[PDB]
Design a protein around this ligand. Sequence first.
Ligand SMILES: Nc1ncnc2c1ncn2[C@@H]1O[C@H](COP(=O)(O)O)[C@@H](O)[C@H]1O
Ligand SMILES: Nc1ncnc2c1ncn2[C@@H]1O[C@H](COP(=O)(O)O)[C@@H](O)[C@H]1O
Ligand code: NA
Ligand code: NA
Ligand SMILES: [Zn+2]
Ligand SMILES: [Zn+2]
Lengths: 426, 435
Amino acid sequence: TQYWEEEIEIMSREKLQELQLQRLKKTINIAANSPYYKEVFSKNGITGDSIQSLDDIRKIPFTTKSDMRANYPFGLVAGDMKRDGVRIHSSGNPTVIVHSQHDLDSWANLVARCLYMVGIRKTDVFQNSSGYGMFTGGLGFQYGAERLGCLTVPAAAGNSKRQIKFISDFKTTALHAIPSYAIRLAEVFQEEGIDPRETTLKTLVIGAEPHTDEQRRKIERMLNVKAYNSFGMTEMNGPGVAFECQEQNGMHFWEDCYLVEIIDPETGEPVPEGEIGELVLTTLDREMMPLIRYRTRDLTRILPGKCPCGRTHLRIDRIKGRSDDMFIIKGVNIFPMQVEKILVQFPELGSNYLITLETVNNQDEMIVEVELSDLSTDNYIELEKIRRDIIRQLKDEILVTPKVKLVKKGSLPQSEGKAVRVKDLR
Amino acid sequence: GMSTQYWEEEIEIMSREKLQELQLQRLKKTINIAANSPYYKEVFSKNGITGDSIQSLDDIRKIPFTTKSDMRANYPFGLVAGDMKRDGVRIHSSSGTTGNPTVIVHSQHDLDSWANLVARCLYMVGIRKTDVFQNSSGYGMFTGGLGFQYGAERLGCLTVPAAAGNSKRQIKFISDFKTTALHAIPSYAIRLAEVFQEEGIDPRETTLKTLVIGAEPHTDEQRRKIERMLNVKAYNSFGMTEMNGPGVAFECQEQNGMHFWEDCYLVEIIDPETGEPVPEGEIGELVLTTLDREMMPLIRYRTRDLTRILPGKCPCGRTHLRIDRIKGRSDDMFIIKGVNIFPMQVEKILVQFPELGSNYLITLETVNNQDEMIVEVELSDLSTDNYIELEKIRRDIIRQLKDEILVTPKVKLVKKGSLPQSEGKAVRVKDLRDN
Ligand SMILES: Nc1ncnc2c1ncn2[C@@H]1O[C@H](COP(=O)(O)O)[C@@H](O)[C@H]1O
Ligand SMILES: Nc1ncnc2c1ncn2[C@@H]1O[C@H](COP(=O)(O)O)[C@@H](O)[C@H]1O
Ligand code: NA
Ligand code: NA
Ligand SMILES: [Zn+2]
Ligand SMILES: [Zn+2]
C-alpha cells in the first residue's frame, strides 16, 4: 500500500485522538469569533476550559441547516473575511461557505490524498465531468488533481459527445462523474461506435448521489473500470471528506480534518457502536468558517474493525439516504434506496427508474417506473412473471404494495445533475 | 507615475534596453524548448533553424508563421515540447467535434506564469485583496473561467465563481456578497444593469466599483455607456487560449491602449497580405510568440486580430507597448455572447440533415440591448411540409448547434430560393450590431 501522507493515514488511534483534541480546541476558539458561535457558546457556557476531552463536544448544541439559513450569508464567518477570504462557494436561500487560502490548500490536499489512495498518479489523465462555477466538485477536484499532478481535462458538465472525444483523443485514464451520468457515457460510446470496455479509462470516481453497490458494479462492467465511492458536501468543503480505499469496503473518513459522530435522529444521543444514525460532523482544519456538530441529514453507520489497507481512519457505510429523501405512504416510512436495492438485482432491468406518489380518490398510491434492459428478454409472459416478482420483493422490503410499470429504455427523464428518483404529486 | 502602484515594478517599468535583452534571452530558450516538439523540430530542419540562428530579436523573422491550420493538422499534441506525462497538469481545448479543435497543454510553471500575469493586470487597474471579485465567465474548457479564478486568488481577492448566466443570481451575489470587481463580457454587463432595474434596484447605487470587460470587440462609447449605467470604472482586457487566455494585454488606469506584457510575449504587427512588418503605428495583423511557456511554446502565431501599436510613453510609467482596441479580423471568425465561432462549424452541422438545402445565412443582431444569432437555412424539397416533423428536426438543429458552437442560436427554416445570393464568395455572416 502507498500513502500520500503516511504519517497521518496510518497514525495510531491514540496519536490521532490527541491530534483531534488539539484541533477541536483550536476550532472552538476560532468559532467563538463568529457572531453565531459567540452567541451559542455564551448561552451554553462554552469557555476555553469546556473542552478537555473529545466527549466534551457533546456539551455544544447541534448546528442545523435552519441555523445556517437564518444566519445567511456570513453569520458563521469566524476569520477576517476582508483581510484573508479568498473564495465563496454555494449549494430557498443558498448555503455559503467562505474559505481562506489555508482552507483551500487543506481541501486540495485531502482531494489529492483521496485520488492517490485509489491509485491515481501524476501520469494519469484526469477528466472532471462535474459542473464548475459555484459547484464545489468543479474547482475541488480541479485543484486536488493538479496538487497530485494529473494532466487534467476540465470538461465540466454535459455535452456527452465532447466528453467521449476528450477520453478518446486525450487518452483519459481517471474520470469523475455522478453515477447516473457514468451510465449515460457508456451508452454514448456505443452510439458513436466505440466499445465502452476498450477505452483508455481505468479508474472512475463516483459520488454526489446515493447509489447501491450493484449500481457501481454495473458501471464497472459497462466501462471495464474500477469505480470508487466518493463522499462530500459543500458544508464540509465538497469532495475529499470520505472516500473508499482499494478494498472498496467502506469510506475512510479523514479524522485529522473531521470529527465524526453518529446520532439517533430522535433523542440526539450517540447511537450504539455500529448502528444506523444521522451523520454529525465538525471541521478540524477549517479557519475562515468552521462548522461544529453540523447535522448533515445523511444516514449511515460506522463499519467496525481495522481495514486491510492499513489506514487507521474510521470507515462509514454507503449513505442509506438523506432525511429529506424519505417519504411516508399509508403510514409507512420509505427510502428510495430500498427500492433501488431490489431493482438492481434484476438483470432484465435498466439503471433508470422513477417513484411517483399520487392520490387516487382519497387514498395514496405509489408507482415504480423502471426501464427495461437492452439485453433482449422481450417475452411478455417471462417479463410479466419478473414484474410480479418485483412487486413481491418490494412489498416484503417497503411493507407496502406498489404499482410497478416496465417502461421503454430511455423513456424516463434524465437530469443534467443528480437524478430525481421521487416525484410526489399529493 | 508618482502615485502609480505596480505588481512587479522591476518588470513593469523596466527600460526598453533591459526589456529587449530579457526578450532575446527568453526567445533563444523558447526556440531551444520548441525544437523538442514534433512540429517545430520539422519546421526548424526544413528552414535551417539552429541554436545560432537567433542572435537578435529581428532574427525571429527567419522562422515561418504558425497558423491555426498548422495547429489543427497537428492535433492534439504535435506542438507539445515538454514531457507531458511527467509534467503536464492541464489541457485547454477549443469547441467542437466536427473538426480538429485547438489544444493548449500547460505545466505547473505555465499555470503559475499565467496566474501571475492575470494578478498583474487586476492589480494595475486598482483591484486589491480586499476586493470581492465576481467572475461571470463560463468555466470548464473556457480559459476566462480558470484564468481569472487563479489570477484573482493569486492577487488575494475574495472570489465569487458565479460562472455564466442566471442574471437574477448574479445580482443576488453582488447584493449579498458586496461584490466590488466584476468580470463580464460588455453585452452581459449592460443586461445586468437592466435586470437590476427590473428587480427595482438602482444600478448606480451598488457596491460595484471596477469592471473588467473583454472577449468581444466593442467601442469606447459602449464602455463609457457601461460606466454610466453602473457608476463604475470599466477596463479593456485582451486574451486568447493560444496565449493562455486572460492576462495577455490590459488597459492601465489611463484607459488609453492596452499594455502588452512584453516579458512574456514578443509582439509583431504584419501586413496580412505580404507577411512583412507594418510601418510603426499602422494597422496590421497581430503575430505573437510566447516567451515564458515551457510545455507548449507558440512561435510567430498568426492571431488574425487586426490592431496597431499606439506610440508615445504612457503616463502610468509602464514601458510595455500599448495596442489599440481590436477593430477586426483577417479571417471569417465572429464572436457572439463572448464565444468564438467559425461559420464552417455551423455548416458541418447543417449538411448532416438531408431535409435542408445548401443556402444558409447567419445574422448577428442586437435585440433589446441583448445580442442574438439567427441561422436561416433553406428547405430541401426532398422533404414534405409535415409541420410537426419539421419543427422536431428544427429543435434537433438548435440542439446539435448548441453542443458544437456552445451558444444557443435562433434557427429559421425558410423557403427554397428565398435567401439572397451574389457570388460563391458570399459572406455566410451578416453582422448588424453597433460595433
Ligand atoms: N458518496 C455519496 N453517496 C451518497 N450521497 C452522497 C455522496 N456524496 C455526496 N452525497 C450527498 O450529497 C450531499 C452534498 O451535496 P452538495 O453540497 O450539493 O455537494 C451530501 O450531504 C449527501 O446527501
Ligand atoms: N478586449 C478584447 N477586445 C476585442 N476582442 C477581444 C478582446 N479579448 C479577446 N478578444 C477576441 O477573442 C479572441 C480570443 O478568444 P478566446 O481564445 O476564446 O479567449 C481574440 O483573438 C479576439 O478576437
Ligand atoms: Na502530470
Ligand atoms: Na481577499
Ligand atoms: Zn482501507
Ligand atoms: Zn499605462
